[PDB]
Every structure is written in structure tokens, then in C-alpha cells.
UniProtKB/Swiss-Prot annotation, chain A:
Secretion signal, residue range per the UniProt entry: none
Quaternary state and interactors: Part of a complex composed of three DNA circularization protein N, three baseplate hub protein gp44 and three sub-complex wedge (made of two copies of each baseplate protein gp46, gp47 and gp48) that forms the baseplate.
UniProt xrefs under Pfam families: Phage_Mu_Gp48 (PF10076)
Factors inducing expression: Expressed in the late phase of the viral replicative cycle. Expression of late genes is activated by the viral late transcription activator C.
Location of this chain's protein in the cell: Virion; Host cytoplasm
Name this polypeptide is given: Baseplate protein gp48
Keyword flag Ribosomal protein: no
Curated annotation (Swiss-Prot), chain B:
Residues of the full protein shown: 150 to 198 of 495
UniProt subunit comment: Part of a complex composed of three DNA circularization protein N, three baseplate hub protein gp44 and three sub-complex wedge (made of two copies of each baseplate protein gp46, gp47 and gp48) that forms the baseplate.
Role description: Required for tail assembly of phage Mu and responsible for circularizing the viral DNA after it has been ejected into the host cell. Following infection, the circularized DNA can be isolated as a supercoiled, non-covalent protein-DNA complex, in which the protein N is bound to the ends of the DNA. Protects linear double-stranded DNA of viral genome from host exonuclease degradation.
Organism: Escherichia phage Mu
Protein's UniProt name: DNA circularization protein N
Location of the protein in the cell: Virion; Host cytoplasm
Disulphide bridges: none
Disruption phenotype: No tail is synthesized.
Domain topic, free-text comment: LysM-like fold region might interact with peptidoglycan to facilitate DNA ejection.
Membrane spanning stretches: none
Superkingdom of this protein's organism: Viruses
Induction, as annotated: Expressed in the late phase of the viral replicative cycle. Expression of late genes is activated by the viral late transcription activator C.
Swiss-Prot record, chain C:
Disruption phenotype: No tail is synthesized.
Induction: Expressed in the late phase of the viral replicative cycle. Expression of late genes is activated by the viral late transcription activator C.
Superkingdom classification of source: Viruses
Annotated function: Required for tail assembly of phage Mu and responsible for circularizing the viral DNA after it has been ejected into the host cell. Following infection, the circularized DNA can be isolated as a supercoiled, non-covalent protein-DNA complex, in which the protein N is bound to the ends of the DNA. Protects linear double-stranded DNA of viral genome from host exonuclease degradation.
Description of how the protein assembles with itself and partners: Part of a complex composed of three DNA circularization protein N, three baseplate hub protein gp44 and three sub-complex wedge (made of two copies of each baseplate protein gp46, gp47 and gp48) that forms the baseplate.
Membrane spanning residue stretches: none
Entry's free-text remark on domains: LysM-like fold region might interact with peptidoglycan to facilitate DNA ejection.
Localization terms from the record: Virion; Host cytoplasm
Protein name: DNA circularization protein N
Signal peptide extent: none
UniProtKB/Swiss-Prot annotation, chain E:
Protein name (Swiss-Prot/TrEMBL): Baseplate protein gp47
Family of the protein in this entry: Belongs to the Mu gp47/PBSX XkdT family.
A Pfam cross-reference name: Baseplate_J
The entry's keywords: Host cytoplasm, Late protein, Viral baseplate protein, Viral release from host cell, Viral tail assembly, Viral tail protein, Virion
Gene disruption: observed consequences: No tail is synthesized.
Compartments, record wording: Virion; Host cytoplasm
Organism, as annotated: Escherichia phage Mu (Bacteriophage Mu)
Function: Component of the baseplate. Probably involved in tail assembly.
Domain of life (superkingdom): Viruses
Tagged with keyword Acetylation: no
Amino acid sequence: TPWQTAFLQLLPSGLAWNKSPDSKLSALAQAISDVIATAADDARQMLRERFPSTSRWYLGEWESFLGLPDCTSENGTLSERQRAAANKMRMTGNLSRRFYEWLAAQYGFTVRLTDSTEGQWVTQVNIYGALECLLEKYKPAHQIYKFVYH
Amino acid sequence: DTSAAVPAQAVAVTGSLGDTLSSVWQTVKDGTAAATAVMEAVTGVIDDI
Amino acid sequence: LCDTRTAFSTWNRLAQRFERRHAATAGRQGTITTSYNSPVAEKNIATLN
Amino acid sequence: SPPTLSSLIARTEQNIEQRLPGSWPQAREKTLSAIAYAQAGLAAGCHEHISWVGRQIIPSTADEDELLEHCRFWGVRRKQATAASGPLTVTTSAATTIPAGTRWQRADGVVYSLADTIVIDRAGTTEITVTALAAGEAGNTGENTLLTLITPVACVVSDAITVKGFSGGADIESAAELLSRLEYRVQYPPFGGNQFDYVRWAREVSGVTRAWCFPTWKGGGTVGVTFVMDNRSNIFPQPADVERVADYIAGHTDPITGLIVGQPDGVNVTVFAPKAKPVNPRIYISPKTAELKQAITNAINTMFFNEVMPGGALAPSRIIRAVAGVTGLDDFEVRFPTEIQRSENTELLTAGTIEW
Amino acid sequence: AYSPPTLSSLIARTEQNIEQRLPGSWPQAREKTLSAIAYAQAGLAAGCHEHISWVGRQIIPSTADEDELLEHCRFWGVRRKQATAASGPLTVTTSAATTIPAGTRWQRADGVVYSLADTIVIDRAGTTEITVTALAAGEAGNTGENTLLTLITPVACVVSDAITVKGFSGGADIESAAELLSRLEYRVQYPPFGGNQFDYVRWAREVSGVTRAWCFPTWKGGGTVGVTFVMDNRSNIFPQPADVERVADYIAGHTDPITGLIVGQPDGVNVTVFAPKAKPVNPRIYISPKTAELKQAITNAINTMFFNEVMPGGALAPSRIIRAVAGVTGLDDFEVRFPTEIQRSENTELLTAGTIEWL
């Protein structure tokens, strides 16, 4: 292990001290430096914790800060919770059908916003192969939606 | 100066304890057993002091 | 208003902001639409930038 | 979730025993025990520093400086404080010109300066406008606060009385308010004229407190926003307020990028204030006291402010919970609102006069 | 927490921790074998404290290292800008009017290759200017004035010389950390731009070539809006149906050049893009001194006035023409004869100066 070697190097150098890999000083160094190794591992995992797309310990705090728990957040899958959080955090865009197709693609689905059939404002969404509530929540104020599956 | 290093640390310890108590205390809004028991605890501490 | 911490960052941001304008106004040297602009105004703008 | 000090001690002692066979580090007052405790203390110190390094990732749990940095990065801009302006009545002896820069000081020490030169020949008391220099909440004063003159000026008496109080002073926002604004921005994503965007636009204007947006209000091309200004006493809107809110939603400049953003051109909004729909409850309480009356009515208004919106329904259970929440009373029998009350989107329910 | 303990403090407190949990009391001057272990433990603690401080400096993007800033940009969506080449004019002369192949190459003395990616046929023996781009991504491939370049592979009836009267321009290296941070903060803060009468002008004007735009809201009633765009840089001012289709496609959907997200028109309203129709007016001014320079000055003044103060669905009084003619000051006497009434038109017709007579 590198941590026991670092602890050994921090010791005084001389003819007295034995730092061979089979001595009692080397036996004790691992037991002594082991804890700090785990602490450094946790401090390194905080780098991954920094983002909500990969957060594990701080998912509850991220969801609270973002007001996440809603329709898009799936039932329990941790990956779905992280995705939903990482999408709502950088959720910003216009009202175009291109942006709405891209938004529905970002959540894993695939839809096509086709032309109307009965009116003008009502727009038809073809879902090929949570989405309904997400679109009804983030839909344009004036327009209305129709849903067709394929 | 070891004699004069104890009060300086005691002041910081007391301040940290006060800050922790203020942060961790949560307001209860009910008038039930929770509120009356909190009242009993506070009045017991005051009785001791 | 700038401390030794933020002086470099703020002046870097201002330098970039002014560099954008200077490059935009200097990249259009000769054009049929630039011919419409008054000469003294263009000089007074370039010097300021 | 850092490990505890006892857990660290136990782990270090177990490691010592595992690496040195036939050893029992948990013995009292021994070298191995002392070394294990020292290492546990050092590990606890780092685990605490790890905890502080965490908890700053998000502005919700962050400290003051990191919260300010997060606000700056996210674009929420602090608004600076404001000065205190007011009318000052100065008595004059003969014709004179008061230059811009003369200072009048209060009895406390706060000075107020004139920002524009004036000329007078009335030989009598006149009224001018004057602004302070502190630019803080201490600037504003009371109804009639006497104040003397600092810089001598020809043909003007030193003392001066202000009949209307100084007002307009304020202070910079707190980090709590900045965090609240940032939390709102993150929680309600901005689109171009979304159902939340209309609410936030109508709320960005001054005075207003709440606003709701009904998409497809009257048809396929109109959306309707209704706002309520509680702070005042009418706790409702006026035609001037409705007109200015509609103008603000129609067009306003963006502080960040400097361009103009607002509602789309094609659609129409037609902002309109809500209409009061009073509800009179019959509540019987066995003890009678004006304080208890005030507590009950305050609880009811807070209930209405929390869980009542235009176009929404109100069950009697909400009222019964609101009245029963009062600590003092003994009986809270409700008689009138037995059935459910509902209203159209144009009219907002209100706790009217109360029958006791 | 903040301000982690110093190494001296760690040494002192670990030594005290070891001293206090033992029965005896160490003398003042001594060299015990537990002191070395205490010092080593303090060094271990101070090493991790520094590691944790570095980790804690990486969360906010304003203080992160370049690699962690790149990670932040990868999460958000901002893409770094790579180094760009440098382009410029090459003045090369041919002997017998040959055709230059698609991938000819020139070399500099330092050893940096320039290439032409195009095909050009020469009509007659003479010097011609061709656009050449460097094959070196960095700033090094950026020459100066009158730099001589030579061919690498000989071409028939092409002498190996290139003068480059105007030096090459370009040669930008990779983006710096501060520039990338500014771009990321722009992406984070830039607000959504829902379809507005102002925003349609920008969306029409962002397309290369388009120089003037106009937006008419509630055209032919509510629910639909009209736009108009023109291109003065070309010889033909008015656009073509291909340009109309291109601008309509750009307005319908495009990626924002400053923010990575996708922007466009509102889903509900109907936009229409129509090319303006010319309604020329022929001035027919009379000038007392007749020469080419004065005619050119008068024409330029009239065209400048038309560029400044003429918009679809507007009126143009002859007083503006009179003022434009009078502003030249190089004349002696002038008279405006054809336009005597206030010219006006509708939205789809744009006023323009026609062929001027007598000058």
C-alpha cells in the first residue's frame, strides 16, 4: 500500500529504525495509516458527489433544493431520480416543436411533434416505441396537445 | 502561557455549543404533549440553575 | 472597489467585453453598407473603443 | 454521514490487533491504546473537514460566502440599498440662491444634501426636496423632525422644520432573501411565456404578492393571469395596477443580458383582478375573550392565505382544522359551512365577516 | 473546517495525546521513540488536510483547475473551442492559363505547409489572388506582409512564387480557462427568448448575408405575424426565394450561437416570410455643374438616405430627397422636378431610388 510507505518515509532515517516490509514498524504502519486512507477515499468521492447527475449521499438534498419530487421523477430507480434532477437543474428553453422533441428525447423517450388535424392550436405528438404529465406541465400556455401512440 | 490558554478555549467552546443549540432547535407549533414536555424540560433546567 | 483577490478576474472580464466590441467594429473595414456611415463618427467610435 | 469517534477508535484498535497477532490494544493506560486514540482523533479531524467540504455543494446548506458566490454564478443579482428623500421647509430672509451641495443635519448627526441648485425671492418659507447621504434604513425619520444647517448660506435662517417625514430608506438584501430568490429561480424553470413564467413575470413587479395563470383561459389562444396585492388594505388590485402589470408582462428589459423579453406577440393575456366571494362561518366557542376572537380570525386568514386560490374549492375540514388549532379555546363547534364552497376562476373565495 | 490546523499544532496535540494517556510524565529534554511516531502521524494528518482542501476548492467553477473546469463544462454542455487555422490571399501568376488542381500545396521557409482546397481555371497570363488556408492549427501558421511562398509539387506553366501582399490572418490557439468560464456563465445565465417582435429581427438578421429586417405583428389579424429581410451587400438588394426558404428554416429551428440549447419560434402563432417588392421612385434632379464626381456624390447621398429612413409600409416626402441633394455642398444650383407628392406604399412594398435622370 502507498499510505504505509508514506508513513514509513515520514519516520526518521537511520541505522536504528527498520523499515523492511516484514518488520514490526511496517506491520504497525498499515494499521495506523489505514483510517486516513479511508478518509481520503471519502474526500475523493466528494468530487463525484459534486454533481447531481452522479450524487448518491446528497440526492435528497439536491431533490429538495430543486423541488424535484413530482411526475417526471420515476418510482424508485436511483438512476431515474438522478436523471430527473440533472435535467431539471439545466431545464431551460423555448416553445418550439424542435425543442420539445429534444426535451422528450433527453428523458429517454422519442416523440415527433407533427402538424394538427382538427384545429390550429392543438398540436399532435406521436410517441414511437411520466411523459404525458411532464409535457402537460411544461406545455406552452396558449397551445393544447393531442397524444397518439405508435 | 498555559494558565491563560484555558479561558480562551472555553469561550470558543461555549460559543460553538450555543450556535449548535440554536441551529438544531426546531420549533413545535402544537399545544400537545410535545409542547408541554418541552416546557417541563426548560423549566427543570431553570429550576436547577 | 476591487480587492487583490478579484482585481485580476474583474479586469479580465472587462478586457474580454471590450475586446468583443473592438473586434466587431474593426473587422468591418470596407463594405457597401459601411460606406453609408459617416467618417467622423467612425473615427470617433474607433478611437473610443 | 461521518463515522463516529467511538467507531474510529474501535476500527483502529481492531486493525492494530489484526496486524500484531496476540495483542490486545484495548488494555487500560497502554502505549497501543494511546496511539489508537491519537489516530482516531486525527481521523475525526479530517472527517470533520470532509463534512465542511461537503454541505457547500448546494446553496441550500452553504455558508454565507459560498451562498453569495453561488448566487453570482447563477445570475441572481443583489440590489443595493437606497437613500432617504424628503420635503424640507426652509425659511428665508430675502432673495437668495441655494447652491447644490448645502447640507442640513439632524439632531443626531445624519446629514442631508441638496442635489440641484435653486433660486428663491419670496422672502418667506419655501419647500424643497432633499436626500440623505448615509443611504440606509436610518435615513428615514418621523413626522416633524427639526434639523439645522451645516454650511452657512447668505440670507437663510439656520433651523428648518420638515412637516412630512423622510421616507425611501432601505437596506441591502440579506443572504436569506438572496437564497430564496435563487431557490425560486431553480425551482421554476423559465420558458417563453410558460404557465410558471407568466406567474413569475406578474410577480416581478412591485407591490404584488401572489399571482396565478390559467392557460387556455377563454379559448385556444388566450391565457389569463390574476394577481393579488395583499400588503395593502384593499388586498386586491385596482385598474391602474392591472394596467401596469399588463404593461410589464407585455414588455420589459432584462437586467442580465440587456435585451427586452416578455410575452409572445401573437397571444393575448387580458390580465384581470379577481372578485371577492365572502364566506360567513358560524362558530360557537364556550370561552369569550377578544384575544381568542383575534386568534381565531388570524388562524382563519392564515388558512385562507395558505390553501385558497381562485377557481379552487374549500372543504369544511380545512376550517375546522384552522379553528381547532387555537390553543386557548375549549369548544369549537362549527355550524354554517357544512357543505363545500366552490367558485369560478374569476372569483377568489375570502373569509368574510365571522358569526360567533 | 475552514483554516485547517497547522502542522505545528497537529504535532503538539498528537504529542500531548500520547503523553497524557500514559502513567509517567516525560522529562523536559529527551528523545523518546513515541515522539517520532507522533510526528509521522501529524505529517499524515497535514497531508490529507491539504488533499481535502484541494478537493473543496473544486466544487465552485470559479476556482476549479482546468481539468475540473472541463468536467464542469462537460456536464453543463459547453464545448471548448479548438485552435483555428489562418487564411489569406496568394498572388500567383501563370504562364499559359492553366487549371489549378483541387489540393495544391505551398511551403514556407520555416517548414509550415499551406494548402488550397478549391479548383480555379485561369483565363489569361496574369497575377491572380486566391484564398489559401494554413495546415497548422496553432498561431505559428500566421505570416506577415509580403511573405514569399513557394510551391511543393510543380505545376505546368505556374512559376513557383507567391507574394502575399496582404498578410495571412487568423491563427487562434485553444481557448483559455477564463474565456471558457465566461462562456459557461453566459450559457448558465442567458434567459429564454420567447418569440417577440424584437426577437424575430435578431433571428432574421443572424443569417449570414441578411442585413436589414422588419417584423409586423398581428399581420392580417391575430395569430400570425409577418417578417421581411433584405441583403444590401449583394448587387441585387432584394432577396431570392431560396434566401426566403433559408431564413424561414432558420427561424423555424436553429441552435443558439451563444447558448447550447435550441431556440425558435413559438409553437402556436404562424410566421410568414415574404420578400419585399420594389416600388422605385425616379428622382430626376437637375444640377448646374455637370461632372461624374457630383453625380456620384448625389447618388450616394440619396442611397444613404434611402438606407437610413425607408421601411416597408412607410411614406417618403420629397423634402428628404431635397435635403439629401442639398447636403452635397459641391453644387451651385439644384432642382427637384419629378417627386412633388408624398410617396407612400403598403407593407409588402418597399420604396427605393430608381434610375436617376440627368445625372
